[PDB]
Symmetry: D2
Subunit: 317 residues, 4 copies
């Protein structure tokens, strides 16, 4: 007895008495992720080096095409696209999908873990689809998750029911359910942030970090880890517990991370796992977007760790 | 045209006029790395999950076995073994290999990049091979390098004539020379260290770090990155420039990283790439070891960055 | 735009307003076939040869387990099993599946193309499931098909709507629809039969062969091909046209091929493609089975070729 | 322990004391075979089918390119090329290679086993390399063998010291020695020939065939098998015993199969395996060719079977 993503999605669509439109969608995503995973591990590179005689771009095209061919979407928002993609009326479904095809594109050359981030909305309204359909607060997410191309490829899927992790057996091209109903640690022992911006941190952030390296109660300090790819850092947080942070600074007073296809998908996964995701002031999932490429600060992770910072945030208010 | 590791290695052994003993060794190694990469990527995991009909220990066995059968080694030192392994008189060769089968094994469950590290010495004290044979300064390395199981698998090989990077094409199980004679930037813009140990850093490290976040002449501060996997952090240093540091601290008064199978191979690769690798007080490669599992502090990366920290070390002494 | 087996099955289940029980079934079969294909191409053989220190049986277990875990079947009949497998009431569905996990097992050692054969029945009755549910004339098949592990792996699926061929892209573990609504040639130019039994053929068969090598109308003779694996011979017939024959002789007066899991699945595929499948006397699909391992003679292929023999059969009646 | 083609080849070159030139050649060949196997198995086909972003010609290019780059060849003869290819003075070596990149190309669309055939001669007439250099009797072969892309990929290598079979483990892209010093059964029980040419067979062939179906002393008749792919039929002959025949007929008065890249390599493998390979009148290996694309009749297989047919040939003359 083994559960595959294909089996799982189908049983879940069945319990929910769906028309089967969203199952077609989740199955198209699984296929797109397997195709990207293969391109990322460099299968076929020899041909490129003349054996017989871009990666973000290939990833964008794969997701966009595999999604359109699902006949389940009406609007697609990608980090690589200035405007939202409105689906041809022939292949139009009722879902709006926001995604980042290959996050951590800067790390590609250094071979660091990279990933794909997606969020699915049910179109709410009754008129010609447009960007406006994508502009829904994260709280309205039907499903969200990510695929991490690291030492192994894993798909983490979060829906109203919970968070489940699927490992890719590359030998048979099938995702195996390896961890179900995942809940994050109440309090972790690792903090993640680019301290190279110390000079730009607000006093609350500055204070938290200080408390982590030099514990006022003389407890053990927190270990530091900052991979440089959100999916890798967040995935480690989900699994090992701790806190990830990318607050505003000179690097945009609005933070660097995008709201629709990065912050929201990850906040949704986080909340479903039993942790928190805040901007320091408000819950990420409650922000009403104004633009499809709107950035937003984010702090996420174990509840006890995110609350501790939230307090320091209040103190300096 | 297309250059494969196999062709490159043979061609080099020919120019060198070797008896083909080292070529067999390097060919065995390459085979062991493709086997580990496959296990690491979780090929066949569906069988553990009951479709019907560890990873560090498995890696150790692969390396040990594939190397013994090469008939080119007499002494083996693994991070996984307390004692040095002495090869059977029947399979003995003239080479001594020091290796870390799967480095970054804490990052396994979090799916972060991990790797294999190897250093190769030639037994010169023709006596019954013993532990003593491995106790040579890194300055005596014949060959050294590593395999990084990241977003893609890469094998970095360093020898007297240079450093060359080989990318694995998993479709045909062949390593392709993607980069020839690799040389690191003189000065980088990323520092890598576990700042969670800030409370235990010597004044030289402490000063250098603060100088990176708050530059005297108001220049751009360095970005921070610390994956937590030496092979991954060092590969980023090699490819993009910067400095990696794992200094001595209370928990590790002599550092954490081992001399023979971690510090030395990375120091050797760094030097051949045109960079520096220091203890803070002396060059890693000149240290004559006393214990096979001896630890050593290490700082490596671009020459201009490593020098700057070396000056601060001189200033506080 | 590309159609995958997963997409295809889902859209077909949707058009048919099914509960989704048969889709779960066809999806479990696709997974089983990918797992068998991988075992057949010998991935992981190195471990068997001690790199770090039955095939029909593995195939039986894979199909049986993957099928039971679909929760869509009540009775399974396998060539490798003396008795029919009655599903645990926990995982009991309404379908009866007859299959040959790995046909051409004798050819394994010689590396000749081998395959899997399956036929799906809807249980008809309302009582405790038993072998008796498998004993339905082939005419009652819901779906049937085969997977051929040859130079490439292909799944041919036949349902009331028609016959469609899916090629396995082993890189992404997905079956791609490469040929839809396949129809066989009216008259082919190849005959397939083990002529080593010439001494045992009845006069009609003897006469047909003679007419093929020495055309009475002085037309070009037919080419001969007999791989030795039914799936390969039949698949070539479907694609290139011609006739395949395995009539009775000293090798059982009932022929060698089994009725439920070999003859029927292939006759069903054949008829749906627009060809014929006969025992010489009657249509294979109309035989009422008496035993689950009942053998039956079979002649199949292009209509004009099968009719020509049928006439010679009548002449000697 | 585990023996890989790479290790085996190097070890043999060492014992032979070669300059490593032939080893490079055999290593290049092995690389070309893994590349063809992958293309043959349809890895990446989903890209032709619009997931968004020949086979014989491709095989030809792979072989030609991978061989030229080995710097070990001066003349190449392909079934795909009218003229013999003369390697650039810059990449020239001392070896001449005669090959059939993808044999059985008619069986491609039917997914039947196909393969690559190669014969290697040493240029002895040290003159500007020309077509003349390839025109050597097979008796002068340095090495010969084939790659069979069947249910699994296998590489059969024959040299002065014997025939060895290597199975490809596609997971790690390594060929494993599965069978050492292969020797064919003295007498088999399967005959292989296209009986659709019965109307054009000489009396010797005609008599031998009828003697196989109707044995004088009532013994068991031989089974018939004719895949239609030489590499596949000959591999079965090699592994299981028997006889393969492609005699001269009206359509092919001198036979169909080519001498240099089909008959010779298979004749060489047969002789080293302890079998016979005849034209009916003379040994295939002793024929001194006049044309690079010269055809020749061929009969090979177990010694006892081939002799029996040779006697019948003597009787009718
Ligand atoms: N595979 C699924 N898993 C969980 N819920 C689903 C699935 N498919 C559909 N649903 C649910 O039923 C609603 C409508 O489904 P649908 O008719 O497929 O568009 C969805 O938006 C979810 O609430
Ligand atoms: N493939 C090779 N590449 C570069 N140098 C080699 C190679 N093989 C052997 N050598 C060198 O020649 C020495 C003796 O080689 P060997 O006879 O193979 O033991 C080595 O220790 C190196 O100095
Ligand atoms: N994927 C499918 N493709 C074609 N027909 C299907 C599919 N699934 C179900 N059906 C049909 O609907 C009937 C009952 O389906 P089910 O409720 O899934 O058991 C089947 O027996 C077929 O007639
Ligand atoms: N790997 C090998 N295995 C067996 N014999 C070899 C090998 N390499 C070279 N030889 C032999 O030694 C001769 C010259 O080799 P070479 O110097 O490599 O050109 C060959 O033609 C064969 O006789
Ligand atoms: O994909 P991008 O645009 O290259 O950025 C990735 C993001 O970049 C962040 C890191 O940026 P900093 O260097 O500023 O820390 C990660 O947290 C996210 O993956
Ligand atoms: O394989 P190990 O014993 O788990 O250690 C890996 C090493 O551990 C260092 C990081 O450890 P810290 O958490 O102490 O920084 C890395 O740079 C090296 O990969
Ligand atoms: O799987 P099996 O039991 O080995 O047999 C396979 C069948 O065996 C038939 C051939 O048998 P003959 O040798 O008698 O022709 C093929 O047509 C079928 O694949
Ligand atoms: O590659 P080709 O030109 O298609 O030919 C393959 C050969 O063709 C012979 C069979 O041809 P016949 O149909 O004439 O028997 C085989 O034994 C050899 O593989
Ligand atoms: Tl991106
Ligand atoms: Tl991004
Ligand atoms: Tl971003
Ligand atoms: Tl380790
Ligand atoms: Tl380590
Ligand atoms: Tl260590
Ligand atoms: Tl069987
Ligand atoms: Tl069978
Ligand atoms: Tl059978
Ligand atoms: Tl050909
Ligand atoms: Tl050919
Ligand atoms: Tl030919």
């Amino acid at each position: 007895n083994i559960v595959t993503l294909t089996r799982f999605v189908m049983e879940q669509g069945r319990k929910a008495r769906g028309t089967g439109e969203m199952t077609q969608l989740l199955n198209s995503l699984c296929t797109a992720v397997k195709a990207i995973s293969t391109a990322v591990r460099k299968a076929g590179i020899a041909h490129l080096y003349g054996i017989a005689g871009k990666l973000d771009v290939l990833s964008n095209d794969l997701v966009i095409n595999v999604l359109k061919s699902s006949f389940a979407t009406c609007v697609l928002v990608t980090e690589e696209d200035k405007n939202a993609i409105i689906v041809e009326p022939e292949k139009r479904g009722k879902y709006v999908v926001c995604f980042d095809p290959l996050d951590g594109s800067s790390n590609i050359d250094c071979l660091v873990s990279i990933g794909t981030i997606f969020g699915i909305y049910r179109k709410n309204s009754t008129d010609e689809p447009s960007e406006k359909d994508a502009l829904q607060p994260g709280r309205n997410l039907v499903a969200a998750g990510y695929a991490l191309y690291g030492s192994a490829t894993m798909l983490v899927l979060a829906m109203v029911n919970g968070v489940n992790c699927f490992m890719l057996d590359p030998a048979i091209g099938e995702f195996i359910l390896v961890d179900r109903n995942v809940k994050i640690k109440k309090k972790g022992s690792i903090y993640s942030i680019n301290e190279g911006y110390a000079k730009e941190f607000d006093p609350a952030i500055t204070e938290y970090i200080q408390r982590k390296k030099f514990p006022p109660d003389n407890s053990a300090p927190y270990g530091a880890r900052y991979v440089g790819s959100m999916v890798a850092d967040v995935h480690r947080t989900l699994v090992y517990g701790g806190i990830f942070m990318y607050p505003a600074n000179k690097k945009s007073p609005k933070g660097k991370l995008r709201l629709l296809y990065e912050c929201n998908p990850m906040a949704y996964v986080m909340e479903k796992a039993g942790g928190l995701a805040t901007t320091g002031k408000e819950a990420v999932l409650d922000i009403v977007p104004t633009d499809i490429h709107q950035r937003a600060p984010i702090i996420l992770g174990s509840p006890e760790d995110v609350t501790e910072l939230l307090e320091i945030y209040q103190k300096h208010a």
